[PDB]
């Protein structure tokens, strides 16, 4: 209950997830998010290429 | 103890595809010789995610993705219907009927072996840890692998205190007084 008496900048760190997650974990979150969305784009490109090849083979 | 060790309820995702969960903690359950695994799945119907409690198979670890469903792969920790695994596969927490969230092969170092399949009537013949043969519906689920903590009974307890510590959290009757050491009014063996 002592945290309700002190101001906001003393209870947090000026960063995303500040005062809730540490800097190493935030860096890991950023890198993992970026790499996984890039891999999703790559997988979607590969799936579209395979679908186009299958459609060309069927037609 | 916080929660019982059960599978997810048999829903549409497990019936028709697969759903992914993440293993967050592997914890000690008092009174049970086997560790438990806390696994978080998504809810397919709402934004909040759901935490489950499974009996942990050996080789499972924190941060591991596991998969529950009909179309899940054949990997340790995945939960599959018995019709989705080949013969010779050993599994844990096998449901007696599809949906009771696990009945057979639950203690440490134990498993159930898929002996065979009868696909016409949708049945599966399995071998139990006691050596018995059972026939279950093929939609019954099981977790691939062997329950962790095997070899627990090999170590001698060596001490009355260690037996007391074992049975205090298990509620089993300890110490055990022989019926022949009693009076005839206390036991039929009394006297």
């Amino acid at each position: 209950r002592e945290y309700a008496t002190i101001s906001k900048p003393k209870k947090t760190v000026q960063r995303a997830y500040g005062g809730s997650r540490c800097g190493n974990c935030v860096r890991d979150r950023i890198i993992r998010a970026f790499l996984i969305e890039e891999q999703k784009i790559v997988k979607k490109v590969l799936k579209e290429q395979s679908q186009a090849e299958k459609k060309a083979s069927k037609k | 103890r916080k929660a019982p060790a059960k599978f997810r309820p048999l829903d549409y995702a497990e019936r028709h595809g697969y759903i992914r969960g993440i293993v967050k903690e592997i914890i000690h359950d008092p009174g049970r010789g086997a560790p438990l695994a806390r696994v978080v799945f998504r809810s397919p119907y709402k934004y909040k995610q759901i935490t489950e409690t499974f009996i942990a198979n050996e080789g499972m670890y924190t941060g591991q993705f596991i998969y529950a469903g009909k179309n899940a792969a054949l990997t340790v920790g995945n939960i599959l219907p018995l019709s989705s695994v080949p013969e010779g596969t050993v599994v844990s927490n096998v449901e007696e009927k599809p949906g009771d969230r696990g009945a057979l092969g639950r203690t440490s170092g134990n498993y159930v072996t898929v002996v065979g399949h009868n696909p016409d009537e949708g049945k599966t013949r399995i071998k139990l840890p006691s050596g018995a043969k059972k026939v279950v519906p093929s939609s019954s689920r099981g977790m691939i692998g062997i329950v962790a903590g095997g070899g627990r009974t090999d170590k001698p307890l060596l001490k009355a205190s260690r037996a007391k510590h074992k049975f205090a959290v298990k509620r089993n009757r300890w110490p055990k007084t022989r019926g022949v050491a009693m009076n005839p009014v206390d036991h039929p063996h009394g006297g």
């Binding site: 890991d28 890198i31 993992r32 790499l35 890039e38 891999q39 | -």
Partner: protein
């Protein structure tokens, strides 16, 4: 064979062993080959593969652990990833 090629590169060529020096080599763009151990964390593995794709550097997935990769390099310490900057007299680049 890859162990023999690696020993030839340690004897003749130039390498940097370790994650931070490998990343510095990839940023410099003078890295000729990257070796990533099998038990490297998947996040770091994806990061190294992205860096090597952006720098157009070949990647070899070493099937041993970091202990085995350090032993193959001839060191008494583990190594999860390493960069070959100069092949020396070896043909490790021709593959």
């Amino acid at each position: 064979s890859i162990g023999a090629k690696l020993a030839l590169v340690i004897k003749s060529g130039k390498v940097v062993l370790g994650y931070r020096s490998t990343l510095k080599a990839l940023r410099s763009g003078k890295a000729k080959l990257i070796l990533i151990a099998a038990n490297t964390p998947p996040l770091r593995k994806s990061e190294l593969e992205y860096y090597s794709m952006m720098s157009k550097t070949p990647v070899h997935h070493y099937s041993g652990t970091n202990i085995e990769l350090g032993t193959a390099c001839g060191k008494l310490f583990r190594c999860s990833t390493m960069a070959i900057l100069d092949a020396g007299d070896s043909d490790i680049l021709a593959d």
